[PDB]
Design a protein around this ligand. Structure first.
Ligand code: ZYA
Length: 215
């Protein structure tokens, strides 16, 4: 596997966004992964819509929570593989309320054919990431309100409660780390990003990792 890969330095990752008061982390995780996978399939990097999932994905619960894998399959099975551009369906759940779904007036910005679920093994997750790109992951984010910067070498790891995007790793650093994109604005952590130690299942990072496959 390569020593260090950071997909941000390869034009593959869009800017950090904000879920606001809505419990929509699952939607941000799922869409961020689709955005990166579309770019790596040889298309221009385009911002895609989390609102589409929060308002229209009735197999999840909007501002109450949801699962990245249910979102990926709602796209393929209920929305004919289509993901709308963020520009044509902007975020509207910042106040913690999800408005009724709108089924027209939007534009398709990417399509996916399905999704794969990766092994519960950090080394294996890293080998796939290095070739194929960013992966959606679920974590225990209980301690993340105290994250100020640096490599978090210890993290409360006992219940998965938040979905985020894994965009790289560096195994040649003093402590190998994972690089994670979050959705609590740029004002949190390292410009919206967090680095956690890699190799000890910090914040339960290896437990629920998956990715969309483009088509
Ligand atoms: C991050 C956030 O905004 C909130 C309120 N929580 C969720 O979105 C949870 C994220 C998560 C947690 C564990 C996983 O293994 C994966 C993602 N999800 C959660 O609340 O899942 C609930 C659910 C809703 C509808 C149908 C089935 C399950």
């Amino acid at each position: 596997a390569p020593a260090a890969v950071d997909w941000r330095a390869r034009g593959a990752v869009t800017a950090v966004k904000d879920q606001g008061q809505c419990g929509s982390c699952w939607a941000f995780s799922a869409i961020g992964n689709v955005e990166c996978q579309w770019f790596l399939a040889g298309h221009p990097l385009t911002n895609l819509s989390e609102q589409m999932l929060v308002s229209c994905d009735k197999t999840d619960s909007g501002c109450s929570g949801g699962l990245m894998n249910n979102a990926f399959e709602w796209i393929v099975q209920e929305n004919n593989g289509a993901v709308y551009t963020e520009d044509s369906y902007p975020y509207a759940s910042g106040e913690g309320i999800s408005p009724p779904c709108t089924t027209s007036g939007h534009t398709v910005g990417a399509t996916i054919t399905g999704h794969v679920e990766l092994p519960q093994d950090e080394a294996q997750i890293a080998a796939w990431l290095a070739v194929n790109g960013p992966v959606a992951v679920a974590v225990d984010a209980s301690s993340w309100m105290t994250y100020t910067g640096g490599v978090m070498t210890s993290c409360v790891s006992e219940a998965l409660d938040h979905g985020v995007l894994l965009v790289g790793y560096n195994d040649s650093a003093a402590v190998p780390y994972w690089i994670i994109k979050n959705s609590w604005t740029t004002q949190w952590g390292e410009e919206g990003y967090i680095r956690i130690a890699k190799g000890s299942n910090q914040c339960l990072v290896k437990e629920e990792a998956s990715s969309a496959v483009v088509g």
